[PDB]
Design a protein around this ligand. Structure first.
Ligand SMILES: Cc1cnc(C[S@@](=O)c2nc3ccc4ncsc4c3[nH]2)c(C)c1OC(C)C
Ligand SMILES: [Mg+2]
Ligand SMILES: [Zn+2]
Length: 313
């Protein structure tokens, strides 16, 4: 109860910033997450024995893939922590509890392959879940881990609070299906511009939580340039392996996944920042003004990718 987690001074300071990198020491990531839960939620939100056993089961159910791994889970949870801390009064106690856990769990048991590859492969998960295939798997895995003896971190919530937090987590994890992001941001863009956006409207909150999840999930593009660039290597290592597996099924992959088109990466990154990243953090910065540093970081990184094309790096 009186047991805080405490980080070294550089981490204590930098963890509060949107662009914090969690570092290469895996054995500190659990404590970094607990630290974030304690400051974001309170030292009473979770029984420490049950939270620590939840964190270690979640870690075990992430695989050794180049990008969609345990480090990504903790990184995405840190971005969410930064959003919640800079927007203190806007979120309920249940939402703060649920969203950090949703981020930690959002890619549980990822295999390093897109929904599209599962469908073309004819993977069993694609028969069980026709859309948001991996994302429904991730939520399924989250529920399974919550139901292990000793792993129910939500046990001290009332019946209705428990149903509300699982519903927050489910929507939050489904929203990380990027195929749903485009329509979600268009709607939010319309509602903000016509003035109809209303954070007391549950269907509006859902949409805003949806965009926060996309923003945390894409946060690789909001780091300092050297983190952004080195993370892109891991992203393309998964994508190119998937492209290799498409070719094995006798399907030419899209250029994004074809390692034979490495050359076009800088131009592909431009389209991505223009089509997805910038619109995302722009609409988020309109709805949640204190998240502006993410939009500034993203634009800085667009400019770094522009310089790569121009041969300046
Ligand atoms: C953070 C991040 C960084 N990079 C990417 C890849 S996106 O930049 C991209 N789009 C294209 C289109 C054509 C193309 N030809 C050769 S590489 C390449 C591309 N890379 C994604 C998808 C990303 O987000 C995924 C995690 C969804
Ligand atoms: Mg995912
Ligand atoms: Zn993710």
């Amino acid at each position: 109860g009186l047991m805080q987690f405490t980080l070294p001074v550089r981490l204590c300071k930098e963890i509060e910033l949107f662009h914090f990198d969690i570092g290469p020491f895996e054995n500190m990531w659990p404590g970094i997450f607990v630290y974030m839960v304690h400051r974001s939620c309170g030292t009473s939100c979770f029984e420490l024995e049950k939270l620590c056993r939840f964190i270690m089961s979640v870690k075990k159910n992430y695989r050794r893939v180049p990008y969609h791994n345990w480090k990504h889970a903790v990184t995405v949870a840190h971005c969410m922590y930064a959003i919640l801390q800079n927007n203190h009064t806007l979120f309920t106690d249940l939402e703060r509890k649920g969203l950090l856990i949703a981020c930690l769990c959002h890619d549980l048991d990822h295999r390093g392959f897109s929904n599209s590859y599962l469908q073309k492969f004819d993977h069993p998960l694609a028969a069980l879940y026709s859309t948001s295939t991996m994302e429904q798997h991730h939520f399924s895995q989250t529920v399974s881990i919550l139901q292990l003896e000793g792993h129910n971190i939500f046990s001290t919530l009332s019946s209705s609070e428990y149903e509300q937090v699982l519903e927050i987590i489910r929507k939050a994890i489904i929203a990380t299906d990027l195929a749903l992001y485009f329509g979600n941001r268009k709607q939010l863009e319309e509602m903000y511009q016509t003035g109809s956006l209303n954070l007391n409207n549950q269907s509006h909150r859902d949409r805003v939580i949806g965009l926060m999840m996309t923003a945390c999930d894409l946060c690789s593009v909001t780091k300092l340039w050297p983190v952004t660039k080195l993370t892109a290597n891991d992203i393309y290592a998964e994508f190119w392996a998937e492209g290799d597996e498409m070719k094995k099924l006798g399907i030419q992959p899209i250029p994004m996944m074809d390692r034979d088109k490495k050359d076009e990466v800088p131009q592909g990154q431009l389209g991505f920042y223009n089509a997805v990243a910038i619109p995302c953090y722009t609409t988020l910065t309109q709805i949640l003004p204190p998240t502006e540093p993410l939009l500034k970081a993203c634009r800085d990184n667009l400019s770094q990718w522009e310089k790569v094309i121009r041969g300046e790096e």
